[PDB]
Amino acid sequence: GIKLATGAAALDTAAAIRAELAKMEPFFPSGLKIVYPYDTTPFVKISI
Amino acid sequence: TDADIAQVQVQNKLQLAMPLLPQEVQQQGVSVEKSSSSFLMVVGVINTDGTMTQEDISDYVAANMKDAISRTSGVGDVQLFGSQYAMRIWMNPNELNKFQLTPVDVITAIKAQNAQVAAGQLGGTPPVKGQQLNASIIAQTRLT
Amino acid sequence: MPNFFIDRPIFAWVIAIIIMLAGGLAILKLPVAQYPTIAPPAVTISASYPGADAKTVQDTVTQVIEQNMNGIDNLMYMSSNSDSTGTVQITLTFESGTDADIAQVQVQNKLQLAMPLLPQEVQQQGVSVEKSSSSFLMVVGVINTDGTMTQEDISDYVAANMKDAISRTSGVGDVQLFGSQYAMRIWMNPNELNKFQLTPVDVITAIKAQNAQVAAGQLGGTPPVKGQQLNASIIAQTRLTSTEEFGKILLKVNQDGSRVLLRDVAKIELGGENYDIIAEFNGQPASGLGIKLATGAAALDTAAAIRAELAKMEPFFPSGLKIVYPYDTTPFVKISIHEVVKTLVEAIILVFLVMYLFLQNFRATLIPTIAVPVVLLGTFAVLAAFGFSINTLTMFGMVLAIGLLVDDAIVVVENVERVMAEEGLPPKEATRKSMGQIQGALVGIAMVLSAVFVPMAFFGGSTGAIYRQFSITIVSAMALSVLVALILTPALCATMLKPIAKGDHGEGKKGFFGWFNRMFEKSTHHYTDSVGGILRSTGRYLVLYLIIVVGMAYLFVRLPSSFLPDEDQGVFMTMVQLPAGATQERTQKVLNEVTHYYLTKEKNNVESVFAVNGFGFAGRGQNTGIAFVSLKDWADRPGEENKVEAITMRATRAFSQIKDAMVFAFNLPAIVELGTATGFDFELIDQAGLGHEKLTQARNQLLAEAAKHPDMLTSVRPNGLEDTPQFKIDIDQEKAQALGVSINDINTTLGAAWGGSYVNDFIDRGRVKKVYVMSEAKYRMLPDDIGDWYVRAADGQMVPFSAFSSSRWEYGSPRLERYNGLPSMEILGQAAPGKSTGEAMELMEQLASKLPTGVGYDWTGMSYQERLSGNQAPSLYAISLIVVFLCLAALYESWSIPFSVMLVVPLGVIGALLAATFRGLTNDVYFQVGLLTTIGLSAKNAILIVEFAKDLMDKEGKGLIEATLDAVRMRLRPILMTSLAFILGVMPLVISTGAGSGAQNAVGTGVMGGMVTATVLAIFFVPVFFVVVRRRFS
Amino acid sequence: PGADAKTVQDTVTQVIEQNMNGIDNLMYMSSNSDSTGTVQITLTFESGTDADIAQVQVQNKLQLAMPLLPQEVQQQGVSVEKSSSSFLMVVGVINT
Amino acid sequence: EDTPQFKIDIDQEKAQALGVSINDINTTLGAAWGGSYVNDFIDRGRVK
Amino acid sequence: ERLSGNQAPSLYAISLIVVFLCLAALYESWSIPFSVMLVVPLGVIGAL
Amino acid sequence: LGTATGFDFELIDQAGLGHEKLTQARNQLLAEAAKHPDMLTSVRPNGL
Amino acid sequence: GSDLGKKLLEAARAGRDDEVRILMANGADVNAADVVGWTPLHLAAYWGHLEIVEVLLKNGADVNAYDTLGSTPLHLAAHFGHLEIVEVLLKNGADVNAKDDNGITPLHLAANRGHLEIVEVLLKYGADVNAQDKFGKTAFDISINNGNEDLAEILQ
Ligand SMILES: CCCCCCCCCCCCCCCCCCCC(=O)O[C@H](COC(=O)CCCCCCCCCCCCCC)COP(=O)(O)OCCN
Ligand SMILES: CCCCCCCCCCCCCCCCCCCC(=O)O[C@H](COC(=O)CCCCCCCCCCCCCC)COP(=O)(O)OCCN
Ligand SMILES: CC(=O)O[C@H]1C[C@@]2(C)[C@@H](C[C@@H](O)[C@H]3[C@@]4(C)CC[C@@H](O)[C@@H](C)[C@@H]4CC[C@@]32C)/C1=C(\CCC=C(C)C)C(=O)O
Ligand SMILES: CCCCCCCCCCCCO[C@@H]1O[C@H](CO)[C@@H](O[C@H]2O[C@H](CO)[C@@H](O)[C@H](O)[C@H]2O)[C@H](O)[C@H]1O
Ligand SMILES: CCCCCCCCCCCCO[C@@H]1O[C@H](CO)[C@@H](O[C@H]2O[C@H](CO)[C@@H](O)[C@H](O)[C@H]2O)[C@H](O)[C@H]1O
Ligand SMILES: CCCCCCCCCCCCO[C@@H]1O[C@H](CO)[C@@H](O[C@H]2O[C@H](CO)[C@@H](O)[C@H](O)[C@H]2O)[C@H](O)[C@H]1O
Ligand SMILES: CCCCCCCCCCCCO[C@@H]1O[C@H](CO)[C@@H](O[C@H]2O[C@H](CO)[C@@H](O)[C@H](O)[C@H]2O)[C@H](O)[C@H]1O
Ligand SMILES: CCCCCCCCCCCCO[C@@H]1O[C@H](CO)[C@@H](O[C@H]2O[C@H](CO)[C@@H](O)[C@H](O)[C@H]2O)[C@H](O)[C@H]1O
Ligand SMILES: CCCCCCCCCC(=O)OC[C@H](CO)OC(=O)CCCCCCCCC
């Protein structure tokens, strides 16, 4: 569960989290997989 | 309000309170954070091949993923939905009483025999004249 | 706007005066430094665990701190070292533009909350969080010539008497002691301890009890008994102050009656806090002070104030103590400034001579001599407004702009002098018409040159910060020059110039000036006839142009690129690197040979060698050191054979003879703050908890693979250290419990004796200092000595370590690296000659993807900076050309004519590349900014040619060839006048051999060469471009 | 706690003061060490100085000195904050 | 102005001879004359 | 107080020159400024 | 911002009454709030 | 000591087979040693480089050379689970009951890290199962204290 720092950019921080997660995926053990069961940012992209 | 300065001012005061707190509370690490109350996103992690339990995945996330997300700029707070592994010593009081031992003896032994000792060097400075050997001394190390 | 100030010359003078005072004020209170802040903000956490191995430090300190570095803003990456000298260094590097003060407090705050999770011994030592802004103004060395003082004695004197007064001196921001103040050293003897049944535990217990501050209270304190006459503070036990007092510490009372004191089981003396480093200055014991400027301070003033304070410390020094100055940037900055001021004054003198040679009246020569200073002073005010400093980059930025400044002055005056000669109008009306012909062009030129220079400021990281210094300086100087060219020079021209009767071209005059006028008038007709012939056969010159563009493209690729040219800075250093396991004494023997060579073979050149045993950049340790060679003054070292270049190559060649020691000399990089910055910086990362050994095997696999591509990669090696034999000792828990020996007594006895132990503080001559207990060297050297240490059991019997311990040799790391919280190994290397660093990185990425499972990689430092600076490059180049095109399109009211100007670019660049290649120089920043000022001035010349041609076609209804031939005829004189002055102006920079000549050569040669082609080619090729473009379109 | 002015000055005041070099816009620095064990070091800054940045620069400099202090001084805590010399008012309280 | 100070000198050799620890001496002198903060308590809901 | 008194001479100097240059620019004159600025002492003596 | 029509009320112990007495005072306020359905809706404690 | 001796120590450690091959041709000292007393055979046995162990033995390397604390290459190989090297050393006459200064045999070390295959090989070449260290501890005593049932079966 990730919370924005006070005054931080929502979509820019979300992009940075996805970039850092992308660096980890290659070195996961077999079977392990990231899922996104809650994200407020995709609404901001699509509505804009 | 500049939340950077608000954090600095709050923690300057907390640091006066810190040493008055119980040792156990200090050793859990007190945290000062400047974040929204509401979640930006939940990053879930599963095993599609059912090779890892709830506990195994939570440890992986805690030990291999969380710290890097926590250091990312703009991330005010990260809640692990689960726990990192610890070495769990689950005591049995029937068997403790049997050998005239208490949890105090268990805690003392773990401190004595799960230790990382600074033991100096062979041929350390200032050395004697004509010293040819210089090597680190390795005594006890953390258990694994 | 020129018409406004031709009628109002007093207004014009007022604006010039306001600009002059604003600039004059700025020159008084502008900060002066060698270089500005370029490297991005980095914060360094530092700690010491006395007697700790690399793993102990990593697994109890480094990981705990690293795990707590959360919720800090604008962190790019984090790297750490944990080494066998008991030291950890964690460097957090932040985004460029981050507030360094905010970054530091946020890091320090997270460390504060982590302190309770660290060991007692580390908490006691403290953990330093400081800004990693390593840029020394000077290093003041302090030595002892009469052999009365050790290095520890000197360090303590400097701590007590000197350091604080230097810290308080004006303009001094930071002061770093090279050594420690005294520590009370208890040198324990295990034979004496065993005789009285004592241990280091007993010594530490006694020192803590008998060297402490006991709180008492008050006589007649509140709440009192009413009628109390006296209130007084009660003073109980206070800290000890002498070696004698520590000697009298009571350890035990024997049964017979006699007392066992601390002096009976230990030698007691004031010594250093640690003995890892042996500093020597020409063989003599030494200490020193590393001094840094406070933000916004003046280098020259501060350096003078430091010397003034040291001067009034002279009388109180003990006999044999002397100050020395092995490193001082102030002499270098003193010359850097003067040599630029000389260029700016000489350039104004050369304009006077060239202006007089052609125009031949003193009233005309004054107008640039006024206007150029007014623009240069104004520039300093705009530097101050943007919060810039007077530094090497901003200073040479003005020298590169002097061509553009001088041109604005010449163009305006020349065109008035011509209009007066051809049409016979009086000065005021002639100036009014003249400005009417160029005012639109000058505003157009201001926009074009802004489009050339402004985008250069928007590069990111370190390289972008360097380009931003030139950008703001050149854009500001150029912008003011245009404002001055529209306000002041018109006014001056209308009020100062003498009339010229119609047709008077000075052909009727006598002597030299008469001959010159008739000579130049012939040459002008020869020139116009020559262009006439060129404009008949344009097709040939397009083929000659494509050869120039291909000739450019070849040299552009063949010329090897760098950042800044190496300088004879008056200093350099020699790395001494003995094999792993080598002792302090062995390293000292090599440094002594190195120090001997420099004072023997280079006795004319070398002033001093500062030998530092125990400190290499690759890592601390007994088996490494560096000698910092200080030279005599540049004047006393004549010729290239007595420079840092020549001495480096001889020293390296000489020291390659030495066996069991890798020893080589090398020059300092231009910006020491920025580091070396050549090739790449690779991080190999353990992403799956593989461990040290599996990461080692993966590193060796990558290094072996790198060696198989010498065509692409060269000098691919690890930055870190190799595993060394270490003495593994296993305490038998069962045996210890059996004999009744506690593990805490065993581990304290082992650690305190062999590693040392910081017990508590004492007060030496009203100054608080540390108390250390440690074994005397004799008893902590070899494995056999382990058996001579005894520990008291519960029952009172003394047990040797041999009874409850076993030992063996195994290999472990003396320096464990980490990157972004995971274990890592830094790999350095560079692209092979001919290949780009981009290609080298692309191969290292490919080789890395074929390493064992769980081994990842990342780019750090210069490679992190370069990989994201390269992304910007194409977009900034594009925007520059797009805006230049759009500015020229608006000026001429044509989508096609712009091309006639924009085609001039290669004509300047070819001669610059020929001059650079010929002279054996590099494509460095000075060369690159030099290209832009060459392109700018050739583009400016081309703009006025095209403007004059188009206006003759548009207004006077002339033909294409008629207008073009008439245009270039009118523009020949001013182009040649600027070119003659500006080429002579940069001639001393080219030939210069002295101090800071590497920078001057890099500036001058790429400009002189570029200007010779840009002038000679453009006067013939610009008319071709205009005619060929005008024919092809509309 | 329990230390006289002279002991407090040598072990705390001088240790902190000699680490307060090269802070931006520092006009002057007064300080006193007294019989109750208290240290107060007031750094006054040039007019127009950001008092918050001043505080931050002082805190960063102090935490270099912090471990050189006695451990009783560390265990009490060291406050670095903006200060003012004059009383705005005195609110009195009495029982009637 | 300079104040008179009452300097107590503890003879540790004489103390060890009589079999009294200097920790018990320091705490007795300190607690008695200066006062000693032991720990907190709760006075009507508030820590004091 | 020391600072206030040290910097006053400079303040009067730059204030007089600014008023001079402003008059010179406005009235395209050196004589109208010099004519005006000579009045300053007539005012200053009354204040003193 | 809020929940349109919602309010966030804090009941304070101003005189060291303690937890039990403040609990009783809370229950008294909740009882009286229930007896005005016309004005107040869903008045409940946020605590345990 | 010698020039090629240092290069053989480095090359044996790193496992550079082709460099060792050349050094053996040029008469590099096979009995060169560290400050700690490690021969190239020690280093090759420790870091698990099988080829070099065989090559050094053919070039008359001392199979029972001991370091300053009395440890043989068999100790290192048996401790760090290099089964192939343990077998090769034993065939070239390695003392299976060799004691370091602590009385620790290759069997003790192999038992401690729980290498089942290596314990059996050492026993086949006549390892003393009842051998005690300075603390009177057998390989069996190590197996029961470590709680290794599989190992404890073999050592009874
Ligand atoms: C965010 C950044 C902002 C920066 C701002 C910079 C500072 C600006 C200062 C404010 C100045 C504004 C002045 C406005 C007044 C001019 C318009 C009125 C003109 C007028 O009626 O007066 C006549 C002058 O007119 C004329 O003939 C035209 C001449 C106009 C003179 C203007 C004087 C301004 C002087 C200011 C100092 C210079 C500052 C640097 C730019 C008097 O005519 P007359 O018959 O009495 O005299 C002989 C005439 N030939
Ligand atoms: C805190 C300490 C700081 C201290 C800093 C001090 C800075 C200096 C302050 C400014 C100095 C002002 C200098 C003014 C000089 C004026 C010279 C007098 C000339 C004169 O009276 O002739 C006028 C004619 O001028 C004309 O016909 C105009 C011709 C052009 C003028 C040429 C001279 C200007 C030279 C200025 C250079 C100064 C550089 C100093 C940095 C008459 O005028 P009128 O009104 O009677 O005529 C109207 C007729 N119908
Ligand atoms: C005449 C000559 O050679 O230039 C001298 C003259 C010089 C350019 C001086 C530097 C600087 O004050 C200059 C300013 C702008 C200072 C501020 C104002 O008051 C100006 C009215 C003044 C005019 C010229 C002057 C007084 C020189 C220097 C630089 C001095 C510094 C070093 C390190 C040598 C120089 O000598 O190089
Ligand atoms: C008019 C010609 C065109 C102008 C060209 C200008 C050339 C470039 C000047 C470079 C700066 C010169 O260096 C600058 O002057 C002197 C150097 O001794 C110093 O001046 C310093 O000492 C003097 C002593 O009287 C003080 O009056 C001054 O307040 C103080 O700043 C500045 O600290 C330094 O910043
Ligand atoms: C058309 C001609 C051009 C006219 C331009 C007029 C602008 C002149 C500046 C106006 C005043 C504001 O500009 C002010 O300049 C002074 C020096 O002069 C700077 O002074 C300061 O600069 C730097 C950066 O802050 C400090 O490290 C340094 O200690 C100090 O000298 C101020 O930082 C700046 O705020
Ligand atoms: C040679 C080393 C120097 C290289 C740097 C200079 C490069 C630019 C060349 C400038 C000099 C050109 O010199 C000029 O050439 C043109 C043709 O090309 C000549 O023109 C002559 O030949 C051409 C042939 O096509 C005829 O069309 C024309 O009627 C005739 O007058 C000029 O009479 C000559 O003066
Ligand atoms: C009259 C004078 C006018 C002068 C004009 C000066 C304007 C210069 C500032 C604007 C350019 C700076 O802003 C620049 O934007 C581009 C994209 O648009 C960014 O570039 C980024 O996006 C582009 C998309 O085209 C990617 O291909 C590229 O990999 C990426 O780095 C740069 O990271 C940034 O540096
Ligand atoms: C209509 C447009 C005209 C615009 C003109 C604007 C002009 C502005 C001029 C600003 C001058 C800078 O202001 C500068 O302030 C400092 C105070 O910190 C003064 O400093 C002065 O006082 C201190 C007292 O401590 C002395 O030690 C110092 O020697 C002295 O110079 C300078 O003398 C002054 O030059
Ligand atoms: C008149 C038209 C000129 C357009 C060319 C100038 C483009 C400058 C873009 C820019 O900001 O780059 C800055 C850069 C530093 O990294 O400066 C440079 O490296 C100089 C680039 C060489 C000149 C470009 C033309 C090459 C031959 C066709």
Ligand SMILES: CCCCCCCCCC[N+](C)(C)[O-]
């Ligand atoms: C914003 C782009 C401006 C380009 C430069 C404009 C110059 C205008 C001069 C030409 N003129 C208006 C006289 O015709």
Ligand SMILES: CCCCCCCCCC[N+](C)(C)[O-]
């Ligand atoms: C005169 C133009 C001034 C531009 C100054 C630079 C703008 C900020 C860009 C900083 N950065 C490259 C790090 O993003």
Ligand SMILES: CCCCCCCCCCCC
């Ligand atoms: C971004 C670059 C814009 C260039 C616009 C050129 C348009 C030319 C059209 C003229 C047709 C006659």
Ligand SMILES: CCCCCCCCCC
């Ligand atoms: C940028 C494309 C140039 C187009 C030139 C148009 C010329 C005018 C049309 C006759």
Ligand SMILES: CCCCCCCC
């Ligand atoms: C045509 C009026 C121009 C006025 C320009 C003023 C510049 C300060």
Ligand SMILES: CCCCCCCC
């Ligand atoms: C034959 C070429 C003559 C060109 C002379 C022009 C000199 C400026």
Ligand SMILES: [Cl-]
């Ligand atoms: Cl004349």
